[PDB]
Design brief:
probable translation initiation factor 2 beta subunit; 36 residues; mainly beta; monomeric; binds zinc ion; zinc ribbon; translation initiation factor; translation
């Protein structure tokens, strides 16, 4: 769903303070997210 044209890559997530960032490796994609 998130990455359909990525196949079998890797997923890493980092959060600081009150902000969430998602990074995907293989396609080099970054997405900004925040719930709090
Ligand atoms: Zn990807």
């Amino acid at each position: 769903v998130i990455c359909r044209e990525c196949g079998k890559p890797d997923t890493k997530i980092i959060k600081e303070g009150r902000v969430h960032l998602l990074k995907c490796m293989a396609c080099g994609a970054i997405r900004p997210i925040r719930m709090i």
